[PDB]
C-alpha cells in the first residue's frame, strides 16, 4: 500500500506495443539479419480498452549505444519509434507526465521472439496538477 506522499497518486496501466520483421534488402551483419522494428505506447482505461496516452507530453526512447543519436524524443501519441537493427536489447523508455508532474522510466525489452508483442506496465501518477488530473479522468477513476 502507498505511504506518505505516495498516497496522493493513482495507478494507470500503460501498454507498450512492439512489432518487427526482417529487411531482406539489408545485408546481414555477421550472418544476423537486420530487422525493422517499431514501438508504440498506449494507455489502458478501467475496462482494458486502449486509448491515446495523452497523459504524457513527451516520450524518450533511450536506445542501445550502437544506434546513432540513441535518445529519440516523440511528442504525440502513440509516440511511435521505428528503427532497424540486428539484436534485441533492454531499453529504458522515459515517459514525461503532463504539467511537469514527473518522469517515469519504463523498462522495456526490444526482442525478436515474436513478430509483435505487447507488455503492460503500471505507473503511479500524482493528483496535484489540474490539467493532468482532468486528462486522467479519461482513463478511469481518479
Amino acid at each position: 500500500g502507498p505511504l506518505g506522499s505516495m498516497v496522493a497518486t493513482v495507478k494507470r496501466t500503460i501498454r507498450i506495443k512492439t512489432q518487427q520483421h526482417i529487411l531482406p534488402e539489408v545485408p546481414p551483419v555477421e550472418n544476423f539479419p537486420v530487422r525493422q522494428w517499431s514501438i508504440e505506447i498506449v494507455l489502458l482505461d478501467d475496462e482494458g480498452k486502449e486509448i491515446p496516452a495523452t497523459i504524457f507530453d513527451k516520450v524518450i526512447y533511450h536506445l542501445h549505444p550502437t544506434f546513432a543519436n540513441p535518445n529519440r524524443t516523440f511528442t504525440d501519441p502513440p509516440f511511435r519509434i521505428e528503427e532497424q537493427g540486428w539484436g534485441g536489447f533492454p531499453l529504458d523508455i522515459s515517459v514525461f507526465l503532463l504539467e511537469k508532474a514527473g518522469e517515469r522510466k519504463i523498462p522495456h525489452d526490444l526482442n525478436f521472439l515474436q513478430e509483435s508483442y505487447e507488455v503492460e506496465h503500471v505507473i503511479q501518477i500524482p493528483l496535484n496538477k489540474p490539467l493532468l488530473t482532468e486528462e486522467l479522468a479519461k482513463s478511469g477513476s481518479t
Binding site: F32, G87, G88, F89, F112, L113
Partner: peptide
C-alpha cells in the same frame, strides 16, 4: 529470434 546485443 533470440538474437541479442552486447
Amino acid at each position: 529470434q533470440t538474437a541479442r546485443k552486447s
